[PDB]
Amino acid sequence: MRNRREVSKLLSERVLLLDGAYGTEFMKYGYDDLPEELNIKAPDVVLKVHRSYIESGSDVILTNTFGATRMKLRKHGLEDKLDPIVRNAVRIARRAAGEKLVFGDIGPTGELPYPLGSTLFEEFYENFRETVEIMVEEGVDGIIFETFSDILELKAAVLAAREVSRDVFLIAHMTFDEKGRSLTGTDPANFAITFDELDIDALGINCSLGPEEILPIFQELSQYTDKFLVVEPNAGKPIVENGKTVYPLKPHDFAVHIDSYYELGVNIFGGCCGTTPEHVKLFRKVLGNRKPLQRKKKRIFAVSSPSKLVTFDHFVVIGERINPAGRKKLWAEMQKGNEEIVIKEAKTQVEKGAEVLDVNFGIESQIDVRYVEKIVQTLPYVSNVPLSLDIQNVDLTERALRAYPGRSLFNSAKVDEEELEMKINLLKKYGGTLIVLLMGKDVPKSFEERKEYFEKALKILERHDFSDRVIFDPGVLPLGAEGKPVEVLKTIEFISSKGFNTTVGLSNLSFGLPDRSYYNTAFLVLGISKGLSSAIMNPLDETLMKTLNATLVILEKKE
Questions:
Q1: CATH no. for residue 188?
Q2: Which of 507, 511, 512, 540 is nearest to 524 (CA)?
Q3: For the range 489-494, what are the long-range contacts, defined as Cβ-Cβ under 8 Å and sequence gap of 24 or more?
């Protein structure tokens, strides 16, 4: 019915009120059936609860479809009922809402992504796409992905939704535990940074905690995104009565928190577990008519995995090892789809100090895309750290970016209009940062030339509003082939003085000479003294890593 720009307009003018819990209301009416099943078995009960919330003052109601996706319904022997369940749900909600807003409610599948579970990104994508198709056809005014615990599954959900419709208002929610972390390790800042740049309209938090506990978590989220914000806390902390978990926070004690959320910039407020029509009635009275607070956000350069957010405010070690070039054994195993060998390589580098891992598949024409998808999806979970996707083929790049669990670093785009625009567009759609290598028509052979490439790059990045999502690689050349490393050090100093992060493929400096470890070490120390903020390097080189740490301590960057 209404599109994202219309809903956005309304939100910019007034804070809206959502609804309350449905399952527990169905139970009070004597129906313990799977909530979604009532859309077919007892539609009158669903309608009654929707009407109770509309009459309580809700501006928006959620369809009775939390578990309505093929992957979850299958677990109840209802996969073949997906269509009627979702269509009926939207029709019933629309009948109750009238002119008010109806948002499709889509929850997670309950299936973890490979390698925790057996599901690959593309299966999650198709699963969510199907439910979104039905909701869009039936006329929802928006869609909210509720209670997600994993960023990859949520990323698949929002990307699938946006593919179905570029006009539907999309809201992404994650649920956090008392420690402020999702099931697979994502904290509020990580969630905000990763999703703020995707084409969604709002971010929010719901479930797991009460209004008091979510406040500091919601605050952190609000500081890192300028998109609309939503919150649906449970009715306080859970307590067990008569052997059951109940959320006892009464209307007044819940309602008094509305101001605290308003102060943090909330745009839509509602309740989750334990919330009843009585709660919503008071929320309506207390909320009244208020214009939302101005939205801004703190800006930082960071990349992430489900459990780790790596901010470039300290020297970042990027492990170079997962690269088959010059590695017979590794190359052979990648070709046969060996995952364990890559996993061990990843874990070992992290254990040695790598905070990010570069991942390259050598001659991509000889590697199985499915293997790439599994590796790209697997490493962030098992090694815990973010990845630097070192991929040449634009096609493989897209497959990797889509399935990447978090905000990645994409390895090199040369200073070439076509190449940059192409990679920039992929990163804008799937999220991520970019390493821009200072070369194009041939390799620069002086500081002056690298500076020109830098300035040409800035011009291109500026025209594509991407200047804040790049790290510059000045281009280290082999000492033997007269690489003139001094020219690179000057370039690092120049770029650092301009406020941009830098990196280098350290090992390329000594590819073809003995004692390469010493040349790599000397260059890194010198580079860091000039502002180098990261390096793709060998974390298994004890000399290099020990001297690096010593350098940082000496320069008072750590201890």
A1: 3.20.20.330
A2: 507
A3: 489/526, 489/527, 489/530, 490/447, 490/530, 491/438, 491/447, 491/450, 491/451, 491/454, 492/527, 492/530, 492/531, 492/532, 493/530, 493/531, 494/447, 494/451, 494/454
Give the pair of three-digit tokens for residue 498.
């301009």
Whether residue 395 sits in one domain with residue 377: yes
CA atoms within 13 A on the CB side of 349: 31
If asked whether residues 19 and 62 sit together in one domain, one would say: yes
Using a 10 angstrom Cβ sphere, with 0-12 exposed, 13-18 middle and 19 or more buried, the burial of residue 455 is: exposed
The resolution in angstroms reads 1.7
Binding residues for L-homocysteine are 22-23, 147
Same domain, 412 and 541: yes
- In terms of residue numbers, what domain contains 285? 1-300
**Are both 447 and 558 inside the same structural domain?**
yes
The sign of the torsion formed by the CA atoms of 406, 266, 99, 19 equals positive
Comparing CA positions, the residue from 508, 513, 463, 515 lying closest to residue 488 is 508
Do 269 and 368 share a domain, yes or no? Answer: no
Q: Rounded CA gap, 400 and 273, in Å? A: 37
The CA distance from 422 to 304, in Å, is 22
Contact 234, 209 (CB under 8 A): yes
3-class secondary structure, 244: strand
Task: Please give the annotated binding residues for (6S)-5-methyl-5,6,7,8-tetrahydrofolate, written as ranges.
Answer: 390, 411, 473, 508, 516
Token look-up 């002056």 returns 448
Residues 86 and 193 in one domain: yes
Cβ atoms of residues 454 and 472 within 8 Å: yes
Return the C-alpha torsion angle 344, 370, 134, 9, nearest 10: 60
Rounded to the nearest angstrom, the gap between the alpha carbon of residue 501 and the centroid of all alpha carbons in its chain is 22
Domain end residue (candidates: 273, 300, 327):
300
Name the experiment that determined this structure.
Answer: X-ray
Going by C-beta distance under 8 Å and a sequence separation of 6 or more, which residues neighbour residue 497?
A: 531
Binding-site members for Zn(2+) are 207, 234, 272-273
- Same-domain check for residues 359 and 288: no
Q: Which two tokens stand for residue 125?
A: 């994508």
Q: Which residues are annotated as a binding site?
A: 22-23, 147, 207, 234, 272-273, 390, 411, 473, 508, 516
